[PDB]
């Protein structure tokens, strides 16, 4: 089982750790070519603007979408979630636009307001959510299953192959969510 991590910027190494700790193989993806032969992809925490700017410049946008179309599961953490969203508050156009959700960037404030809080995650209780300049999900489509909320805000969601959260699980030692994603990959490889 081969899981990519989008390695343009951000907390790449952290995801790799989790992936390897759950027994899968991690592959750092800085180029389209590296997408080939992968069973799933992780879009890490980092700076969504930076990631987009790099995605553009090296023509990764289309190949990522093709990767999605191929039915390969994709896990977006924080900025990762931002990349997946169909709609971004204040943005005329999104990034990948693969998930039927509206997100608001930097909705909790600035780094000073970054925080940690225990969460109840439907498929995955007491999961420590780490919110570092996190966005939030304003609105979710009908196809989307809400997996967790914090103070009446949607912070985790699934849509078939797509998995998303506001927080950064890769900063904790708790791998339950990574496992839950790996499962999705396992189920997907079969079809």
């Amino acid at each position: 089982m081969k899981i990519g991590v989008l390695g343009l910027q951000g907390a790449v190494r952290e995801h790799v750790r989790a992936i390897e700790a759950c027994g899968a193989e991690a592959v750092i993806v800085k180029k389209s070519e590296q997408l080939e032969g992968l069973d799933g992809l992780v879009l890490p925490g980092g700076e969504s603007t930076t990631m987009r700017r790099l995605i553009d410049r090296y023509g990764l946008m289309e190949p990522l979408k093709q990767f999605a179309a191929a039915g390969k599961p994709m896990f977006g953490t924080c900025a990762g979630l931002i990349l997946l969203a169909k709609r971004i508050v204040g943005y005329d156009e999104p990034h990948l636009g693969l998930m039927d959700i509206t997100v608001e960037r930097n909705s909790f404030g600035r780094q000073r307001e970054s925080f940690e809080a225990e969460l109840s995650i439907k498929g995955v209780d007491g999961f420590v959510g780490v919110f570092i300049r996190a966005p939030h999900i304003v609105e979710a489509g009908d196809g989307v299953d809400v997996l967790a909320t914090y103070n009446d805000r949607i912070v985790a969601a699934r849509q078939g192959q797509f998995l998303g959260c506001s927080f950064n699980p890769e900063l904790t030692d708790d791998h339950r969510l990574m496992q839950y994603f790996l499962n999705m990959v396992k189920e997907a490889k079969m079809a």
Binding site: L8, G46, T49, T50, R105, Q111, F115, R133, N168
Partner: protein, 290 residues
């Protein structure tokens, strides 16, 4: 129960900066150029380090106006930074919403003996270091991120290379060192032993460590990554260059694709004039930390 200011949150914010470039900016225009070029954050100041050098005088925290200005201009994090030991400056930058504070040796130090007790803040700090002892002392004070000191404003990476190499070598030693030798090591290094123990337990440094000082070319940027930097700080080398906007893209792209030499060669191609820089033969400048 939302907990703020936890080490995990302070350090995590830095872990989210890895693989990227943080750019010194004196105004919003520059900040926008930086965001557009792909910077992961911007460091706000009154004068760029090369100008700090050239002007001399006392360098302090930037005017809050400028910081607010820069904050309003971008969606990426805004750092700023303070003079060494200047507790109140740091409180001020915190009150302003600054995302990360740089307790910086490029500014004129306010306390020549004691650094800020960073542990008492909610906003994280980044500090400079030349070696693991220095590193570990900053960490013990509460620093949540580190950078090489280099020699800022010189256009010369040699110091940053020295520092990155030293720190990385000393980490490797500690990681594989015989457990019973750490207390005596700590003493030799001037380090807090608990930090060395954390390093050894973890198998790596428990905070992010960036290169900073003299980074002038895409090759310079990729070199630091090659030497194990978690990312780079650039100030003078972009905005003292011929075309800042063009430099900025190239450093960002080289930092990210630091092993693609064909690409780096291409990105280096059209650059044009880089800042002249300074050899050395400086009597006292920089390396002011304790």
């Amino acid at each position: 129960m939302a907990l703020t200011g936890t080490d995990r949150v302070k350090r995590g914010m830095a872990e989210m900066q890895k693989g990227g470039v943080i750019m010194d900016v004196v105004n919003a225009e520059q900040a926008k150029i930086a965001e557009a070029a792909g910077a992961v954050a911007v460091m706000a100041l009154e004068r760029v380090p090369a100008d700090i050098r050239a002007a001399g005088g006392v360098a302090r925290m930037a005017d809050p106006t400028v910081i607010e200005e820069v904050m309003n201009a971008v969606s990426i994090p805004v750092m700023a930074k303070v003079r060494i030991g200047h507790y109140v400056e740091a409180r001020v930058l915190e009150a302003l919403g600054v995302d990360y504070i740089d307790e910086s040796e490029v500014l004129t130090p306010a306390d020549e003996e004691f650094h800020i007790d960073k542990r008492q803040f909610t906003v994280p700090f980044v500090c400079g270091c030349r070696d693991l002892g220095e590193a570990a002392r900053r960490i013990a004070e509460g620093a949540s991120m580190l950078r090489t000191k280099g020699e800022p404003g010189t256009g010369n990476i040699v110091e940053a290379v020295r520092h990155m190499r030293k720190v990385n070598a000393q980490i490797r030693k500690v990681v594989n060192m015989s457990e019973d030798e750490l207390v005596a090591e700590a003493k030799q290094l001037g380090a807090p032993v608990e930090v060395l123990r954390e390093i050894k337990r973890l198998g790596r440094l428990p905070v992010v460590n960036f290169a900073a000082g003299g980074v002038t070319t895409p090759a310079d940027a990729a070199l630091m990554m090659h030497l194990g930097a978690d990312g780079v700080f650039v100030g003078s080398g972009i905005f003292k260059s011929e075309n800042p906007e063009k430099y900025a893209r190239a450093i960002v792209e080289a930092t990210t694709h630091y092993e693609d030499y064909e690409l780096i060669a291409h990105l280096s191609k059209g650059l044009g004039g880089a800042m002249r820089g300074i050899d050395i033969a400086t009597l006292l400048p920089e390396h002011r930390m304790q």
